[PDB]
Design a protein around this ligand. Structure first.
Ligand SMILES: CC(C)C[C@H](NC(=O)[C@@H](O)[C@H](N)Cc1ccccc1)C(=O)O
Ligand SMILES: CC(C)C[C@H](NC(=O)[C@@H](O)[C@H](N)Cc1ccccc1)C(=O)O
Ligand SMILES: CC(C)C[C@H](NC(=O)[C@@H](O)[C@H](N)Cc1ccccc1)C(=O)O
Ligand SMILES: [Mn+2]
Ligand SMILES: [Mn+2]
Ligand SMILES: [Mn+2]
Ligand SMILES: [Mn+2]
Ligand SMILES: [Mn+2]
Ligand SMILES: [Mn+2]
Lengths: 519, 519, 519, 52
């Protein structure tokens, strides 16, 4: 039992997440001219585009353009911003001056990147929004790219985060009071409708909120409640297997990992079936480790910090699922959240313990800090064996390995995929969405020997850690796929892309949305 | 909750502390000649003074003096002892020989030290008492200094400790059977009355007892009981905020730090108002971490050893408060004990958790092993906001940082102080009392940026640990002072001065007594 | 200067490498029947193939086949061996019994692997050769695969190594006396002529020898002498820039890395131009760190062990070059060996030193143990700027990062490549040759910021080591490409594939040979 | 306070944009504004004025 004040805070936080609405809206230049008649929304305007786009004659026709802005365009550095005052520009806030911040997007983009470079878009707008003078204002963000989806997600993830505990925000269910309403103004009417773009942005930001949230607010229980709240509101199915019932029902992996914690582990499965025939049946599985202390294999404090992000895969699949429901995408979806806190205490699963996985395979625990793969093993078996359908594609997303950062870096999620076709499709989705990925070695014949055990079917940790660590963690997960499943399996290791130095990025949902789109 | 045998042991230990009486008494040479008529109290006598004092003609008139003693004076090394037998010296134990141990105190003393060098006095008497032949005897300690307060504390802290578990003492409520009664014989009638000196010595030793006591005996609960016992006996007020009530009442800092532990955290506030108009209103706040395991940021065993001393600041303020009550010093006092065990388990506050402090400010926990500043933050806000008066001066005392030892060393507590005047006054009190201090950098404009947080008002740990660490910990505490408070704030970091290789020193109470004296 | 006995030993070792001849020959079943008329070469015969190949009717017609061998085929485990005695089988050693060892090769092979699974072929033959009874024998190795190139290299790298210091071999210029002559018997006449296969095998084993050799034998000087010896013998060009001349000629990278060592660094460039028009101009550049102690950034002993392998990239390109010359492949080649010992002493380049690279770019040395990329920077600039031709393709090979093992593992060299076409071609070559590769992230826009320096053009080490470390090391190298070069650059990180628990693998040369074949 | 001294108005680069920079600049921060047609030795169309 929790103190009443803490329970009240948790309920309010749940509600803040269930009712989360985005601060971003979308329009185009002609519609803007028509609706606002040259009156800026506030005393700040942002203009972002490539060196060339910024010099297009059409830019001169923008309502804030003048010779100072032209000079800003000359003086701005690639990847940088440059601000100029414009006197007596009509604006809804009534200010003698409007500040116009120009940002230059690079055109350089490697074959593994998104050509629109939404990464820099995000950074530019973030920087520009630091010039906001007052709160509760609307900032016009004029973008010269028509790459609407990656730009939508880029702007959604930019600026001050909706999650905040600063300056009394704790009393307002941790809804930030520092966020500006953002009006993205594309050159042309967007190929994807504005309300659809809002739904994408909303999911990016909800994902960000969940990840940013500390574990004292986002627990196994509150995450479950949030999912249940969305289920009631949007009318999808929710199945919860909780605490000791996991043990009784043979879910030894997730049970063992989570059982030491104050809040019980949960296997939460969400179902969405579209009207009419689905283009595909897809099962999503997310690593929902609300906090990873390491268990008995305790992390040092510097590594343990930011392990509140260890549910980033669960948040990603959860929010991608929400977007699919909200936009009524024609994909049949399961979304299985593998919720646990990897805690330390008398009930800790041990370095030596042998787990009976839901798959029936036994796992010797070499290291309790390799918890994610165990939890996901139960998740994928559940998805591929225990649902009312058998999926064509299984996608698991997880903040799984430090190796991932070493291998594919801070901006590219690592892909371990059993089929070239699915892999290429996810890579395409990454390049289109901006939520970029890169493959890691798929070679089960070389991963399999690393998990030999004297007494169990397998260990949970490689004998040699310098033998394709991102890949091996993926391999472990595959051993727990049901034999009934013969489809494509996409393992997404997103340990690093889910955050940056400002906090969560909301990486993952837009990737999924784009992937679903092209199925 | 506890086994019956353990509960009985705890009660007995509480009683041993509540009823603690000192082994030291004080007199002077003429009163001694008058009451004992040249008959030594036992077969051991100690003579301590400087090279010059030892050669004063008055020394020849001491009842034990003879040519052997004169020779001891020639042979003794500075900072050392030298013992000689004297045959047929009248003594109350009827010993054929009396052992006379001479000890030479240095005169060398830097401007940051106590000129009477009580540090050496303590060491000399400690060494001399090792020559005690039988226990339960009274040893005459003839001191040639008239620096009565520092000598009183020095002798109080010397020799075998009143806390012991050796040789069956556990059955006697851990009251040592190895302690000698000590009769300090000053040259002149002491400027401070003997019974007043006893009260000081008593507080030094009670402080020593509490600090020495292992955490299986001195818990959050037993410390609270001890305070309550003294409150009934001496007639002062006691307020206790316990366990989950700390959470309900907004004391998020001390609640979060303490909640993992077996015994609940407590905020214990004691009040003393003198009969007259007080010279000053002073609020004392003490770090009462009964044991600091580090929490989830677990300490290695070699660092974790001696973290039973982590309540040294609470003991210091508690015992300083007792002395003020017993001697009826004309200071109005609050004494707030911030009691918690920093424990590891499922309920552990986390590296990532965000705390809502009593001050209303939010704290992002970077490292759970920086618990003291958090607990103190709630303590100082309580003192400056929640009491029936507003203090002129806030003094917090805490075994706060390893940096303290690096900066100011084993014998000098570090002072972080917002006013030059209060700082100088505490320094002077340290020099007079022998419980020496030294300032650390006060520069809030440079400390403040170290605690920047993405999501909370502040972190609990510096981004850079090599940027005035003693000072930064102090700074943190100041951020939680009430806006209602506009007085002097003295932060005392006494991590190292509270112990030496023999255990607790009882450092702190005498410092406070002397400070109160000169207000 | 060296002791005379050490100089004699080095000369002999040089000669052993320059004159190295392989122990492997190649034939086919019909030619074997014709030349040996059913008489086995010795008392051991090896039969290796897939489960299915082993059950082909043709197997029954092999000269050693009998019912015991049929049983061995039933009893052998996948990836294992099984031996049976056959009495009175004609053999050249006149052995009462012939031991026939059957080995089963798996057919399982992922899309990133060589379908013939030469990895297992090597392991099987290695195991089987442990049954050799006497030395200086010829062992018939009957292979059921017709994948002649990968099998040739697989057998070349198997069994006991030609480098040895056991049992007096030091007195025989470290030529092992434990090696068996091996006669590989393919089912059909090999698509590649036997003498051409011998040249491939010879290069695999020479590469192995150089890598296995400890740095007291294989020094910057002896490696250079070996290259000169081959140049005299085969009639290709050799250019040597030695020691202080590197500094005088602006080769600040390789000079600074190597200058602390007892033996001077050398930039050794070899040239081969075929008769007639080359299909391509290719420049090879190899990391020839004869020993990597870490420099002032000293490695711990457990990591420093096996840094004699740190010239594995130089050995690879060197031997790939030799094969091209010996087989007269129609490729114009340069081969640049970046030879240095990364030593520790008074002349050590420092953590802080600023290097003026041959490229004209300055490099701030953050860490002296990131030496390889520096040495290679000078190598690739040399190749792309200082030769009599400009290459179409630059291939650098290096044992460059620990990240490589983490990312792509022990069997797959990491590829960082500026063009998709070249990457795909090298990957194809890896799958055909058996010397498998896998790509790492190519994304210069994300690597570049990691190398920002306050005072130099760049650092030699990433600010963040968890941001695509294999890729970032590659990126560094690319910054030193001449602007004159506009072709394909293939960076091969082969830190782990160059060795296994038995020592060097001779990985690299066959990869190159196969790549050159398909140009 | 120094930035709001009347003497500041008499500086050769001062104009209403600069005055606005003084309002908008954050403590410990900078804020830059363009001033068109201010005489300068480099003959620059605009002079950038950075207030701190
Ligand atoms: C110690 C090892 C057995 C396993 C360890 N991984 C973990 O503990 C995972 O549960 C982590 N949740 C993976 C991770 C690492 C760094 C940043 C973000 C995420 C790892 O090193 O990757
Ligand atoms: C790990 C850091 C965040 C903070 C740490 N301090 C602590 O844990 C405090 O709670 C300790 N109670 C301070 C301490 C250290 C050494 C000897 C006596 C007392 C310190 O290093 O000073
Ligand atoms: C210390 C770091 C700056 C760089 C370091 N790399 C090196 O020292 C390279 O010179 C090593 N030669 C790379 C290496 C590491 C492990 C096994 C084989 C080869 C690495 O750890 O990757
Ligand atoms: Mn984890
Ligand atoms: Mn973990
Ligand atoms: Mn502490
Ligand atoms: Mn601590
Ligand atoms: Mn190296
Ligand atoms: Mn190195």
């Amino acid at each position: 039992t929790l103190p009443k004040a803490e329970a009240k805070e948790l309920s309010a936080f749940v509600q803040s997440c269930v009712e989360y609405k985005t601060n971003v809206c979308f329009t185009d230049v002609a519609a803007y001219e028509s609706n606002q008649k040259g009156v800026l929304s506030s005393g700040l305007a942002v203009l972002v585009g490539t060196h060339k786009q910024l010099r297009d004659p059409a830019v001169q026709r923008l309502p804030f353009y003048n010779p100072a802005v032209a000079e800003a365009i000359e003086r701005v550095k690639e990847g940088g911003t440059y601000g100029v005052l414009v006197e007596g520009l009509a604006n809804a806030a009534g200010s003698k001056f409007v500040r116009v911040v120009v940002g230059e997007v690079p055109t350089k983009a490697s074959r593994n990147n998104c050509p629109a470079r939404p990464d820099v878009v995000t950074a530019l707008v973030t920087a520009a929004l630091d010039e906001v003078k007052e709160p509760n204002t609307t900032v016009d963000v004029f973008v010269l790219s028509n790459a609407v989806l990656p730009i939508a997600a880029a702007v959604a993830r930019c600026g001050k985060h909706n999650f905040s505990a600063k300056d009394g925000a704790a009393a307002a269910a941790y809804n930030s009071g520092k966020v500006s309403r953002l009006q993205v103004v594309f050159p042309e009417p967007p190929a994807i409708p504005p309300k659809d773009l809002e739904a994408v942005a909303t999911s990016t930001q909800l994902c960000q909120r969940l990840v940013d949230a500390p574990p004292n607010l986002l627990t196994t229980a509150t995450f479950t409640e949030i999912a249940q709240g969305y289920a009631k509101a949007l009318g999808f199915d929710v199945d919860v297997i909780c605490g000791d019932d996991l043990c009784e029902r043979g879910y030894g992996g997730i049970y063992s990992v989570g059982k030491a914690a104050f809040e019980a582990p949960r296997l939460v499965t969400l179902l969405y079936t579209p009207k009419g025939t689905p283009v595909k049946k897809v099962s999503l599985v997310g690593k929902g480790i609300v906090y990873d202390c390491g268990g008995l294999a305790l992390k040092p404090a510097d590594y343990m910090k930011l392990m509140k992000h260890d549910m980033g895969g669960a948040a990603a699949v959860f929010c991608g699922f929400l977007t699919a429901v909200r936009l009524q995408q024609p994909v049949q979806l399961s979304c299985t959240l593998c919720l646990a806190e990897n805690a330390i205490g008398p009930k800790s699963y041990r370095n030596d313990d042998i787990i009976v996985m839901k798959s029936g395979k036994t796992v010797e625990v070499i290291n309790t800090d390799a918890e994610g793969r165990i939890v996901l093993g139960d998740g994928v078996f559940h998805a591929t064996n225990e649902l009312s359908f058998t999926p064509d594609v299984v996608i698991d997303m997880a903040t799984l390995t430090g190796a991932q950062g070493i291998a594919t870096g801070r901006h590219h999620a690592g892909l371990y995929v059993n089929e070239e076709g699915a892999e290429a499709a996810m890579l395409r989705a990454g390049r289109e969405s901006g939520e970029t990925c890169f493959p890691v070695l798929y070679c089960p014949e070389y991963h399999e020997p690393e998990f030999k055990s004297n007494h169990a079917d397998m260990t949970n940790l490689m004998e040699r850690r310098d033998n394709a660590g991102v890949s091996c963690a993926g391999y472990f997960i595959t051993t727990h796929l049901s034999p009934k499943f013969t489809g494509a399996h996409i393992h997404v290791d997103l340990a690093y892309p889910v955050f940056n130095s400002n906090g969560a990025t909301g990486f993952g949902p837009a990737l999924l949305t784009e992937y679903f789109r092209k199925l």
